[PDB]
RNA sequence: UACCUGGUUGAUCCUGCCAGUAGCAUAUGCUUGUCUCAAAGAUUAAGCCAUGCAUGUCUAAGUACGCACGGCCGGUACAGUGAAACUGCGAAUGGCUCAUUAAAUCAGUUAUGGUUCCUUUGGUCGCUCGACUUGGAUAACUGUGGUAAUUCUAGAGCUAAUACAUGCCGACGGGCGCUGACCCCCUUCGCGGGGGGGAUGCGUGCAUUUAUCAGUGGUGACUCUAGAUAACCUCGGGCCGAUCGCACGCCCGGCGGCGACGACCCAUUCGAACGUCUGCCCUAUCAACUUUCGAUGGUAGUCGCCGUGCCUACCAUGGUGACCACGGGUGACGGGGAAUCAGGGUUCGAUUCCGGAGAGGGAGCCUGAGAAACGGCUACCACAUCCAAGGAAGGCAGCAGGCGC
RNA sequence: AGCGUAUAUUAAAGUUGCUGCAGUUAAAAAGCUCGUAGUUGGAUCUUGGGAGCGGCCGUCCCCUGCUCGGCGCCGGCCCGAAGCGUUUACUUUGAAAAAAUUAGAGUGUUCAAAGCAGGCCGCCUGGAUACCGCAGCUAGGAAUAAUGGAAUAGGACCGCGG
């Protein structure tokens, strides 16, 4: 099949190697997962030593970590924006490790709001008619308010994250190989990384 | 090959088994076990060739399949089971106890012990290891794990285990002025007192050892096994006490004993 | 100045987006009595294969050569000269074996003819298996 | 034992080769009483093969309702021996040959802190807070068939499991991190300020994947081994015993040892795999070679058991050479070794031990811990067997043996 | 109870010459000079004492300086140790190096080639040792042979100013 070995190609000098043995098994090669965005699809692969290796073929959810304040939530992937390796992997919207994807902002917003007693997203003037969010932002007992006021002291999020929350899609980087483990675990882009990537996609925009 | 080998040609077999050339083609490929294949002595070789109870492979099978032999207080009915350095072979019906320890030369001694001494053994620690919930583990030379050791034992110390319970009684710490047997190299079976350890970052640390007659010899730290505090052996030693007198002296002792014998 | 390529250059060990109210550097001593140099501790480059500030561990052989070429990037060719002993004629013959070697951007100003000590580590590339640990400048070079 | 002798001239002294002289190992000639050892289809054809064998397997301990034998009182399922068959395991070792192969193989030296590991051995196996034993098929066996044909098999009726599946209870009473209703106490007249408890809800163990924080043991050196926190858990599924055998017990229906088998993870053993440094025969009538279809590096991935141009994308213009690269030849598998030898040395090493490669030539894969396996499968070239003419089965460089050479 | 022939190879072959050949005339020195790799390169830096035993003789010892307990004595001296010291080639020691083969210790296979056995009126033995170039590793030596150090002083040391 596909051989993954050194003896098929030229030496440090540029001489041709003559193959002293035919293709071995341990010099193996399987086709690329090229994992897409759809409903969950994973196929199992029996690998060397009789272990298992999961091919994510389609994947829409992943365990992402906004690790500024240590808040990680399982989130719904929507589409891919930028890819450092190749540009056609964004056209044919394939997940690979170190992609840039948009993720559902709602689990992070929910947590931030329920933790800090302030709103996030929620543009100015928009009426909060449901008023179960009212009970999450109001009605505290005596000393719990001492706890939530010494908390919300350092509740200040950065502007470039606020912008994304107001739209409703955060930028995250896939830190787990989706082809190998059958996952899409990542982390939300922040500060210097976020500025660098927003600029790279705007140069791509033109 | 395309997998693990199962045969061992009689010429390619470890030499200290002292196998002849014209008996057969193959030698007993020792079963996998606690000791290494080149540093073991298979139960078949010890039982039939040294003691000469059995005459053939069938007789060794017959002697052991009656559950008679007991290596480290546990019954073994396996002819190619690797019995190695610091083991207590306990044949129950004859009422004998043997301990495998290196003769003055590069071979195993048929060394009979007392049943009071045949209830412990002297294990060297190979690695100290932190468990899954801060549970410290020892791993000894004979592939034997003990968890919750002494918090003092470290990576080149010797421990004394009880043979039924399998737990530490005492330990000899690796430092100067401690009895050590050499268990590898050309100095295989020399008993001496540690003189100096010389650290070599990246390479193998070399340890200088002094014999009982002011004979001094070095060996890399991999091939050392401390068996005593000061000059005190913690087990019984074989006849000679790991000295290795010269071929000139060994000639003199042999023929002088022959002259006096007649 | 750094982060020229598509992907974001950073040290994977440290976290750089801690909520607050200069960047700390990951580095390590590499043993065998080698001094972790100053451009490693203080500097602001990103190198996977820098033996002081990156993911690579020195183990096995430690050799020395003399710098020949420095044309390919973050890598040098050193030239190791020895004598081979033919036994028929009780004489030697002068031989050489030039090998590809990873030079960290730590060792800023290195010229050809410098006596460069290298240490063996995991295969870094097709032909590269060694990494520069120290540099000794050629006899003089004061003026 | 560090050795010479004949032959150019009419005679001489030299250069110089031809011929003698001795061992060695293949063939061959003539000859052969005894006895102990012992090589042998390597050289040419890694050419071709008729036939027969060369790999199977049951213990007191996975499944026996074959009367195939056989105890008896059978009425309380199963005496026992045991064909077959399902299950597990082995068939990757051994054996044969030397065609490939010239920094390749291989040898000495080291590395995996860059990995995988059946088995053996020693650890782990109420650490998880939520059933006195479940499910429905199949084989053997009875029965009916098809084909010129083979270790080919379709249909019917029945019945097992450590095959294939599904799943409890227990331990189990609570801890432990958040969540926080509600409450008593004191300093200030009082706001305020200080802790104490605390209904409820969520979460939990090892393994897997990701991100963040701190600093039990070890190394020359970890982004190590442990500890904490926030989550995730692949439905083509990690673990957390619906298994078997001899013993038979311990007090008012109750009531425990000794073994076999299995199982995620860790170590150990047997290894394998990929790297480090040095080393090989002849050739210049082989002087330049490599590279956008990867040649040498850089960043990001893909694949892999892991490290890497191993393979993609975008960059950079490198890398090797008179110290013989690149190409070519080899009547070349490499080494331990063998014959010859004063001392140097020359030639040989297919050949019983270690390593490599191959099963007529190339390529692809199944199952498994381990194979790119051929006494396994799938084609395509070459060759070739049996044909009721439709189809079918092949692989001796295993042991014998036959042609050909 | 063996001997003759055919061919491959070794010594004789100092007729491949490193040890160890030749080049006026026997075969052979480029027609001549320059010249980069290659090989090879003058002399020069440590001599010298203290002390001891036999018979002026001989042979044995001593030759950079600086954090932790006991010969201990009194923060003082000694030792012990963890860290040190321009590099390499050379030589000596040590470590690690599969067996079989060769060299070789033992042993009346009836002798021998072999073999790893055996011997004593249950017991006593054996199954050694040496060599294994080159490369890597280790610790002594410092002759010989390379290489380095102050010369627009960014010299060493010594202390203050920072």
UniProtKB/Swiss-Prot annotation, chain A:
Keyword terms of this UniProt record: Acetylation, Cytoplasm, Isopeptide bond, Lipoprotein, Membrane, Myristate, Nucleus, Phosphoprotein, Ribonucleoprotein, Ribosomal protein, Ubl conjugation
Primary location recorded for the protein, binned into one broad class: cytoplasm
One record GO biological process: translation
Composition bias type Basic residues, residue spans: 7-25
Lipidation (N-myristoyl glycine): 1
The keyword Cytoplasm is assigned to this record: yes
Keyword match Phosphoprotein: yes
GO MF term set: structural constituent of ribosome
Sequence segments annotated as region (Disordered): 1-26
One GO location term (cellular component): membrane
Lineage top rank: taxon: Eukaryota
Covalent link Glycyl lysine isopeptide (Lys-Gly) (interchain with G-Cter in SUMO2), residues: 169, 192
Localization annotation: Cytoplasm; Membrane; Nucleus, Nucleolus
Protein topology in the membrane: Lipid-anchor
Record PTM N6-acetyllysine, positions in chain: 36, 127
Pfam families the record matches: Ribosomal_S8e (PF01201)
Positions of modified residues (Phosphothreonine): 129
Modified residues (Phosphoserine): 159
Summary of subunit composition and partner proteins: Component of the small ribosomal subunit. Identified in a IGF2BP1-dependent mRNP granule complex containing untranslated mRNAs. Part of the small subunit (SSU) processome, composed of more than 70 proteins and the RNA chaperone small nucleolar RNA (snoRNA) U3.
Protein role: Component of the small ribosomal subunit. The ribosome is a large ribonucleoprotein complex responsible for the synthesis of proteins in the cell. Part of the small subunit (SSU) processome, first precursor of the small eukaryotic ribosomal subunit. During the assembly of the SSU processome in the nucleolus, many ribosome biogenesis factors, an RNA chaperone and ribosomal proteins associate with the nascent pre-rRNA and work in concert to generate RNA folding, modifications, rearrangements and cleavage as well as targeted degradation of pre-ribosomal RNA by the RNA exosome.
Protein family (similarity comment): Belongs to the eukaryotic ribosomal protein eS8 family.
Name of the protein in question: Small ribosomal subunit protein eS8
Underlying gene: RPS8
Swiss-Prot record, chain B:
Crosslink feature (Glycyl lysine isopeptide (Lys-Gly) (interchain with G-Cter in SUMO2)) location: 229
SMART domains named in the record: S4 (SM00363)
Primary role: Component of the small ribosomal subunit. The ribosome is a large ribonucleoprotein complex responsible for the synthesis of proteins in the cell. Part of the small subunit (SSU) processome, first precursor of the small eukaryotic ribosomal subunit. During the assembly of the SSU processome in the nucleolus, many ribosome biogenesis factors, an RNA chaperone and ribosomal proteins associate with the nascent pre-rRNA and work in concert to generate RNA folding, modifications, rearrangements and cleavage as well as targeted degradation of pre-ribosomal RNA by the RNA exosome.
Protein name per its UniProtKB record: Small ribosomal subunit protein eS4
Sequence similarity: Belongs to the eukaryotic ribosomal protein eS4 family.
HAMAP family xrefs: Ribosomal_eS4
Any one biological process term the GO annotation gives: translation
Compartments reported by the entry: Cytoplasm; Nucleus, Nucleolus
Curated annotation (Swiss-Prot), chain C:
Gene Ontology terms, MF aspect: rRNA binding; structural constituent of ribosome
Modification sites for Citrulline: 20
Positions of post-translational Phosphoserine modification: 57, 100
InterPro entries, per database record: NA-bd_OB-fold, Ribosomal_uS17, Ribosomal_uS17_arc/euk, Ribosomal_uS17_CS, Ribosomal_uS17_N
Keywords assigned by UniProt, alphabetized: Acetylation, Citrullination, Cytoplasm, Lipoprotein, Methylation, Nucleus, Palmitate, Phosphoprotein, Ribonucleoprotein, Ribosomal protein, RNA-binding, rRNA-binding
GO cellular component: a single term: cytosolic small ribosomal subunit
Entry's localization field: Cytoplasm; Nucleus, Nucleolus
Top-level division of the source organism's lineage: Eukaryota
UniProt keyword Nucleus present: yes
GO biological process: translation
Coiled coil location: none
Residue positions of covalent lipid attachment, annotated as S-palmitoyl cysteine: 50
Assembly, per entry: Component of the small ribosomal subunit. Part of the small subunit (SSU) processome, composed of more than 70 proteins and the RNA chaperone small nucleolar RNA (snoRNA) U3.
Family: Belongs to the universal ribosomal protein uS17 family.
Protein name per Swiss-Prot or TrEMBL: Small ribosomal subunit protein uS17
Protein source organism: Oryctolagus cuniculus (Rabbit)
Gene that this polypeptide is encoded by: RPS11
């Amino acid at each position: 099949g596909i051989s993954r070995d050194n003896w098929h190609k030229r030496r440090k000098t540029g001489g041709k190697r003559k193959p002293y043995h035919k293709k071995r098994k341990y010099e193996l090669g399987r086709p690329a997962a090229n994992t897409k965005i759809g409903p969950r699809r994973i196929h199992t692969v029996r690998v060397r030593g009789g272990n298992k290796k999961y091919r994510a073929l389609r994947l829409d959810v992943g365990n992402f970590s906004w690790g500024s304040e240590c808040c990680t939530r399982k989130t719904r992937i929507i589409d891919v924006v930028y890819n450092a390796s190749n540009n056609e992997l964004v056209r044919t919207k394939t997940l690979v490790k170190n992609c840039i994807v948009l993720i559902d902002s709602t689990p992070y917003r929910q947590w931030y709001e329920s933790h800090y007693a302030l709103p996030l997203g929620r543009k100015k003037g928009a009426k909060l008619t449901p008023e179960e969010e009212e009970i999450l932002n109001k009605k505290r007992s005596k000393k719990i308010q001492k706890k939530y006021d010494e908390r919300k002291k350092n509740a200040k999020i950065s502007s470039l994250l606020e912008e994304q929350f107001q739209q409703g899609k955060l930028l995250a980087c896939i830190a787990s190989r989706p082809g190998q483990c059958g996952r899409a675990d990542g982390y939300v882009l922040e500060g210097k990384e976020l500025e660098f990537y927003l600029r790279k996609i705007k140069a791509r925009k033109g | 090959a395309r997998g693990p080998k199962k045969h061992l040609k009689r010429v390619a077999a470890p030499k200290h088994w002292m196998l002849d050339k014209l008996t057969g083609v193959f030698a007993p490929r020792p079963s996998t076990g606690p000791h290494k294949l080149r540093e073991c002595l298979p139960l078949i070789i010890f039982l039939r060739n040294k003691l000469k109870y059995a005459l053939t492979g069938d007789e060794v099978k017959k002697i052991c399949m009656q559950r008679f032999i007991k290596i480290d207080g546990k019954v073994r009915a396996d002819i190619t089971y690797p019995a190695g350095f610091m083991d207590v072979i306990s044949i129950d019906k004859t009422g004998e106890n043997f301990r495998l320890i290196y003769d003055t030369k590069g071979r195993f001694a048929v060394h009979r012990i007392t049943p009071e001494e045949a209830k412990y053994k002297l294990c060297k620690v190979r690695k100290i290891f932190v468990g899954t919930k801060g549970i410290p583990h020892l791993v000894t030379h004979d592939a034997r794990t003990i968890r919750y050791p002494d918090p003092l034992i470290k990576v080149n110390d010797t421990i004394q285990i009880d043979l039924e319970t399998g737990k530490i009684t005492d330990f000899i710490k690796f430092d100067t002025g401690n009895l050590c047997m050499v268990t590898g190299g050309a100095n295989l079976g020399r008993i001496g007192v540690i003189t100096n350890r010389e650290r070599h970052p990246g390479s193998f640390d070399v340890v200088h050892v002094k014999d009982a007659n002011g004979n001094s010899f070095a060996t890399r730290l991999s091939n050392i096994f401390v068996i005593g505090k000061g000059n005190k052996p913690w087990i019984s030693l074989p006849r000679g006490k790991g000295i290795r007198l010269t071929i000139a002296e060994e000639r003199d002792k042999r023929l002088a004993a022959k002259q006096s014998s007649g | 100045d750094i982060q020229t390529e598509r992907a974001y250059q950073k040290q994977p060990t440290i976290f750089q987006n801690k909520k607050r109210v200069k960047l700390p550097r990951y580095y390590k001593n590499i043993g065998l009595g080698f001094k972790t140099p100053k451009e490693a501790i203080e500097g602001t480059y990103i190198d996977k294969k820098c033996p002081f500030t990156g993911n690579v561990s020195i183990r096995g052989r430690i050799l020395s050569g003399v710098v020949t070429k420095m044309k390919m990037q973050r890598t040098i060719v050193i030239r190791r000269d020895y004598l081979h002993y033919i036994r028929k004629y009780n004489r030697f013959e002068k031989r050489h074996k030039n090998m590809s070697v990873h030079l960290s951007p730590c060792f800023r100003d290195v010229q050809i003819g410098d006596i460069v000590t290298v240490g063996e580590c995991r295969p870094l590339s097709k032909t590269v298996r060694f990494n520069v640990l120290k540099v000794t400048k050629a006899a003089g070079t004061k003026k």
